């Protein structure tokens, strides 16, 4: 520990704690920058040297969070709740959280080693065909691509069976040990369990109830969608393997976790005679290039009179693919270095209509970072953890439209045909609405484990209960408590909350509606754009400047006017497809929901 990074002495006063907050701030951006710089380099190009620098940076960060966290508890754990500023209470409350650093070394060294071991066995999971094969598969590319692409039911089944079997089972013992150790650490931090810690972020005493009220508002839309898809699969696979009343076999939905079904959009799409618009042909013809695209993205924000990207951003960012042959993580990401001056993007840009949209949300994050850089570092995070991605997405929504592309000049004429825009809303529904029930059930399920209400003998039972209850899916081959299908997801062994994403996808439209309402727009909400609309920016800026200083429920209210989440705006956005599906279901006599829930298909005749 460098002494300039090691805390000093502070009194039990607020007057002291204000000085503690100030000292933590000044040290914090000096450590976090050094940490993120290393992590930036390692990700900007892989080298074992940079991986080492990445590893050392990780340790240096934790060592810093520890050295300060321990004193924050020692001096202010008896007090912090008392302090007059809600901003300061947030500052100290964050520092005062220690997480795993509560565990004594013996447990601590098991804990880290245990968490790493889960990620290893998941990331390095494998499935092998039932021969003396030279070669096995892995989740990507082999499994993701066969599962999405092929539709011979047996082959599709085996791929799903192998994965949840191989990925889950060897996790089963580890995940229990994680659960015990996880809760024990937070107990000392001040939470009943890890689950009550995660819910602490949303600072809402009624949080879990709020979700069910939201989800109940979605269920008519989701059931409408689910019931529609279910019929389509019946056309494809046969009466033996689908029940037009029952739930859907989990592996037919084109995705290993059935969390988003878009790979059956090719099978289901409405109005097969219409195209789906691709503006790439203009963009290449215009001589658009990656470097230019961001200037369009910046144009948008400048058009809202949000802040332009500072010169440092253009000096630093890796907008283009590198000139070297060096290996790089191409997946696009946006970075804030807590050093106030320089913000950074990595995009690996390929000039296509899709990545044009993608750049806009990635720059959206940068605009978000730019606005709250003025806060003390402890607060420089989204108003709540799903709130940051929402401000990212509302931007991509607007520009994805044909309407905005015409103001970009990339589109020649607007073509207001509902058959086309239904195609667009429906694919987006198969992407994101299918995700809401899944995103909801996981963190209910994990809260069930962390609260203990799902003891280890029920890990798998409570999972499939939650799947059929919410997502309308059931397992394709009988699954029993030797298995552990909850582990087969990325976010579970990586102990990463999904609930942020669900909160975000609701805040997304709850903003978009409140912006389009403010931008003077009227008409079909998916045809709104806010570009050039200074009225939207000045209100949006008020959200971004707040960062996390001000409780999100108060900030959301200042933007939208509602003290809480609501899915009515989301239903407004999807309204056109909502109507269309209701017609199509009513025409087919399709039974919304899934009675005969106690059904799942027989096995293929010679399996395998
Ligand atoms: C990615 O795309 C970027 C943008 O490309 C341009 O725009 C897009 C939409 C497409 O249409 C592209 O085809 C198009 O090229 C590229 O940056 C641009 O690169 C080109 C070529 O390298 C640049 O063109 C050259 O610019 C010189 C400077 O011209 C400006 O400055 C003069 C003073 O030096 C001034 O007198 C001019 O009026 C001009 O001012 C610009 O005005 C327009 C509006 O009228 C603004 O939009 C600009 O921002 C203004 N820029 C400034 C600095 O004020 C010219 O001297 C030069 O002409 C000479 O060279 C050409 C060959 O290049 C000869 O053919 C010609 O006869 C003459 O001798 C030429 O115009 C362009 O300026 C760059 N953009 C900017 C903003 O500077 C990226 O390089 C590209 N990257 C990749 C990898 O593709
Ligand atoms: C969390 O902790 C950070 C870091 O300690 C605090 O930032 C510092 O806050 C103070 C108060 O706002 C700020 O002082 C003001 O800075 C303005 C710019 O001052 C710069 O120029 C003068 C000369 O004109 C220098 O004397 C200063 O040291 C500054 O120097 C420049 O700083 C930038 C930014 O880091 C750096 O990139 C440049 O390299 C450097 N210049 C050169 C030539 O190298 C003044 O206009 C103003 O009047 C005040 O002096 C101080 O500069 C901040 N430092 C940094 C590193 O950010 C945060 O305030 C704190 N958080 C909160 C919420 O308070
Ligand atoms: C990924 O990005 C990083 C940052 O841009 C980039 O880092 C550089 O990589 C090169 C090798 O490709 C490093 O060069 C050597 O590093 C070794 C130690 O690992 C040194 O022994 C070498 O010393 C000589 O060179 C020095 C100047 O670099 C001289 O001052 C010295 O006297 C010796 O003559 C040499 O430094 C370089 O150090 C790193 N730098 C950093 C900051 O990482 C890396 O190249 C990129 N990846 C790829 C594949 O290009
Ligand atoms: C932060 O506050 C602490 C506690 O008020 C200060 O700690 C004290 O620091 C002095 C030196 O400034 C230490 O002196 C040592 O005392 C022992 C005898 O106990 C002697 O054998 C050593 O040779 C040395 O003189 C003292 O131990 C230490 N005491 C405590 C309780 O921490 C500290 O000075 C303050 N920080 C700063 C930067 O001033
Ligand atoms: C994380 O997983 C790894 C791998 O399962 C665990 O490391 C393994 O630990 C065992 C002993 O605990 C090692 O087996 C022993 O090896 C020695 C020879 O080194 C042998 O004499 C013993 O009879 C026994 O076979 C095993 O080699 C070791 N593997 C690796 C790769 O290190 C680790 O303990 C797990 N940690 C947690 C927290 O789960
Ligand atoms: C939960 O369901 C699984 C199947 O999905 C059951 O596990 C299976 O049980 C049978 C009977 O023991 C195993 O067959 C045996 O395999 C061994 C080779 O491993 C072979 O030598 C025997 O002759 C016999 O064929 C089968 O392999 C096994 N599968 C797995 C993946 O373990 C399990 O019994 C069910 N849970 C409970 C509590 O019964
Ligand atoms: C910190 O907590 C204490 C205890 O809840 C508060 O002290 C009490 O304050 C009320 C009025 O605010 C008095 O009627 C009590 O007599 C006080 N009790 C004691 C033991 O002093 C204190 O006000 C809180 N501080 C803040 C800033 O809210
Ligand atoms: C598209 O045409 C319909 C015609 O009824 C109209 O109601 C709708 O508002 C048009 N789109 C926009 C963005 O105005
Ligand atoms: Zn994002």
DSSP string, 431-491: IIITHHHHHHHHHHHHHHHHTTSS-GGGHHHHHHHHIIIII-EE-SS---TT--GGGGSST
Residues with CB under 5 A from ligand 9 (ion): 389, 392
Q: Let me know if domain 104-257+432-532+542-601 sits in CATH 1.10.1370.30.
A: yes
Residue 389 annotated as lining a ligand binding site = yes
The tokens for 246 are 């029952």
Q: How many angstroms separate the Cα of 605 from the Cα of each of 157, 163, 241, 497?
A: 12, 21, 12, 40
CB of 3 closer than 6 A to ligand 4? no
DSSP output for 117-160: HHHHHHHT--B--SSS-S--B-IIIIIHHHHHH---HHHHHHHH
Buried b (16+ CB within 10 A) or exposed e, 408-439: bebbeeeeeeeebbbbbbbbbbbebbbbbbbb
Count CB atoms within 10 A of the CB of residue 549. 19
Secondary structure class of 344 (helix, strand, coil): strand
Q: In whole angstroms, give the CA distance from residue 159 to residue 477.
A: 12
Q: What's the DSSP call for residue 551?
A: -
114 CA distance to ligand 5 middle (Å): 12
> Quick check: is 600 catalytic?
no
Q: Report the nearest-CA residue for atom 32 of ligand 6.
A: 482
Query: Taking Cα atoms as reference points, which of 270, 232, 584 lies closest to residue 426?
Result: 270
180 CA distance to ligand 5 middle (Å): 21
> Quick check: is 583 catalytic?
no
The preferred substitution site among 18, 20, 27, 29 for testing ligand 2, maximizing ligand atoms within 8 Å of CB, is: 29
- Structural element, H or E, at residue 346: strand 343-346
Count CB atoms within 10 A of the CB of residue 534. 13
The preferred substitution site among 9, 16, 20, 71 for testing ligand 4, maximizing ligand atoms within 8 Å of CB, is: 9
Q: At what angle do helices 499-518 and 435-450 cross, to 10 degrees?
A: 140
Nearest ligand to the C-alpha of residue 292? 1
Q: At what angle do helices 207-237 and 435-450 cross, to 10 degrees?
A: 130
Secondary structure class of 345 (helix, strand, coil): strand
Q: How many angstroms separate the Cα of 608 from the Cα of each of 153, 166, 257, 583?
A: 11, 17, 22, 40
Q: In whole angstroms, give the CA distance from residue 337 to residue 296.
A: 24
Measured on CA atoms in the order 216, 218, 221, 224, is the torsion positive or negative? Answer: negative
- What resolution in angstroms, rounded to 1 decimal? 3.8
């Amino acid at each position: 520990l460098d002494p300039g990074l090691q805390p000093g002495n502070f009194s039990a006063d607020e007057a002291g704690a204000q000085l503690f907050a100030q000292s933590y701030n000044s040290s914090a951006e000096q450590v976090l920058f050094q940490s993120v710089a290393a992590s930036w380099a390692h990700d900007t190009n892989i080298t074992a040297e940079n991986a080492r620098r990445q590893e050392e940076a990780a340790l240096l960060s934790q060592e810093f969070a520890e050295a300060w966290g321990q004193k924050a508890k020692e001096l202010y754990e008896p007090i912090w709740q008392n302090f007059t500023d809600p901003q300061l209470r947030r500052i100290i409350g964050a520092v005062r959280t220690l997480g795993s650093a509560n565990l004594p070394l013996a447990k601590r060294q098991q804990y880290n080693a245990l968490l790493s071991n889960m990620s290893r066995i998941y990331s390095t999971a494998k499935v092998c065909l039932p021969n003396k094969t030279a070669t096995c598969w892995s989740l990507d590319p082999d499994l993701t691509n066969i599962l999405a692409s092929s539709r011979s039911y047996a082959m599709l089944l085996f791929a799903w069976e192998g994965w949840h079997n191989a990925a889950g089972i060897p996790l089963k013992p580890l995940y229990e040990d994680f659960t015990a150790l996880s809760n024990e650490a937070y107990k000392q931090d001040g939470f009943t369990d890890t689950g009550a810690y995660w819910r602490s972020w949303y600072n809402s005493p009624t949080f879990e109830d709020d979700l069910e009220h939201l989800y109940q508002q979605l269920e008519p839309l989701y059931l409408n969608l689910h019931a529609f898809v279910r019929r389509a699969l019946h056309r494809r696979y046969g009466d033996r393997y689908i029940n037009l009343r029952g739930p859907i076999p989990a592996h037919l939905l084109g995705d290993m976790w059935a969390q988003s079904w878009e790979n059956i959009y090719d099978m289901v799409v409405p109005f097969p005679d219409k195209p789906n618009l691709d503006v790439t042909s203009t963009m290449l013809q215009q001589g658009w290039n990656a470097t230019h695209m961001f200037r369009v993205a910046e144009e948008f924000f400048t058009s809202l009179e949000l802040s332009p990207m500072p010169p440092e951003f253009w000096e630093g960012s890796m907008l283009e693919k590198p000139a070297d042959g060096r290996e790089v993580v191409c997946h696009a990401s946006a970075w804030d270095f807590y050093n106030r001056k320089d913000f950074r993007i990595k995009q690996c840009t390929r000039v296509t209509m899709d990545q044009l949209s993608t750049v806009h949300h990635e720059m959206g994050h940068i605009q978000y970072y730019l606005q709250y850089k003025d806060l003390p570092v402890s607060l420089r995070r989204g108003a709540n953890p799903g709130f940051h991605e929402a401000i990212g997405d509302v931007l991509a929504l607007s520009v994805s439209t044909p309407e905005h592309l015409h103001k970009i000049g990339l589109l020649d004429r607007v073509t207001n045909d509902t058959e086309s825009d239904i195609n667009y809303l429906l694919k987006m529904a198969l992407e994101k609405i299918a995700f809401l029930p899944f995103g909801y059930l996981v963190d209910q399920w994990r809260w069930g484990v962390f609260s203990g209400r799902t003891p280890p003998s029920r890990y798998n039972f409570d999972w499939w209960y939650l799947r059929t209850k919410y997502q309308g899916i059931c397992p394709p081959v009988t699954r029993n408590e030797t298995h552990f299908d909850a582990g087969a997801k990325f976010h579970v062994p990586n102990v990463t909350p999904y609930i942020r994403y669900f909160v975000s996808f609701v805040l997304q439209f709850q903003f978009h509606e409140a912006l389009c309402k403010e931008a003077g727009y009227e008409g079909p909400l998916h045809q709104c754009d806010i570009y050039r609309s200074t009225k939207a920016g000045a209100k949006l800026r008020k959200v971004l400047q707040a960062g996390s200083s001000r409780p999100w429920q108060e900030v959301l209210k200042d933007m939208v006017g509602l003290d809480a989440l609501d899915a009515q705006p989301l239903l407004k956005y999807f309204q056109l497809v909502t109507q269309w599906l209701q017609e199509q279901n009513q025409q087919n006599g399709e039974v919304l929901g899934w009675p005969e829930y106690q059904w799942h298909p027989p096995l293929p005749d010679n399996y395998p």
